[PDB]
Amino acid sequence: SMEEKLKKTNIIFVVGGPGSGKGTQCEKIVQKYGYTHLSTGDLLRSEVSSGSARGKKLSEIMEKGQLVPLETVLDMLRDAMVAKVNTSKGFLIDGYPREVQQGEEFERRIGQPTLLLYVDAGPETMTQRLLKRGETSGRVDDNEETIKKRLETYYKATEPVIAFYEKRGIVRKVNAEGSVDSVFSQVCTHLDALL
C-alpha cells in the first residue's frame, strides 16, 4: 500500500524562519543526495497561480504572513508525497510543520520524521535577504510589513516544533548565517553522519 511505502522512506523536516535559506539548501541536498524536495509554500503558490477563488483566499492569507488551514496544506502535502513515493530516495519537507498540531497530524496520516534539519538564522539576516529578494522578485509576501508578520508567526508557532522534536533526539542544527557554501558544509556533516 502507498502508506506502507511512506513508512519505509526517510522523512527530513527542514525547519527555519522566513528567509533562513531552506529552499537554497534543499536544492543543494537534492543535487548531492537525490532526495525529493517538497515545499508547502511552493505547492500553495501553485494553487494561487490557477487564478481560482480558492487560490485567492489562500493568497490573501499568505500576504498577511499567516498560516493557511491545516487541512488544506496537509491534504496537498500528502497527495504530493503519495505521487512520488514509489521512486523517491527520501523526502525533504520544507516549511511543514509550522505548529505542533501540524506535526501531530502528519504523524497520524503519514508517519514520524527520521530527522529535523534546523536552519537557524537571526531576524536581521532574514529581513535583509527578503528585502533584497523583494527588489527583483515577483513574490507577493516580501514587503517590509509582511516580513514582520512572517517573523512573528514563526517565533510564536513554529519555534515550539523544534523543542517538541528535540525530545526525540532527531534535531540537527546549522548556523544559517554566512555563505551558501559554509551552510551546506554543515548540512553535509549532519547527513553524512546518518547516511
Which residue ranges make up the site for ligand AP5 (CB under 6 A)?
Answer: 16, 18-24, 39-41, 44, 61-62, 65-68, 73, 95-96, 98, 102, 129, 133, 150, 179-180, 183
Query: Which of 11, 32, 163, 169 has the alpha carbon at shortest distance from 77?
Result: 11
| Shortest separation between residue 144's beta carbon and its own copies, angstroms | 33
Minimum distance between the CB of residue 115 and its own copies, rounded to whole angstroms?
24
Task: Compute how many other C-beta atoms are within 10 angstroms of the C-beta atom of residue 189.
Answer: 11
Closest chain position to ligand AP5 (CB) = 41
- The set of cell numbers assigned to 16 is 527555519
Strands (E), 104-190: 115-120, 171-175
Residue 101, CA atoms < 13 Å, CB-side half-sphere: 6
The verdict on whether residue 66 carries a ligand-binding annotation is yes
Known binding site for ATP: residues? 19-24, 133, 178
Known binding site: residues? 19-24, 40, 45, 66-68, 95-98, 102, 133, 139, 150, 178
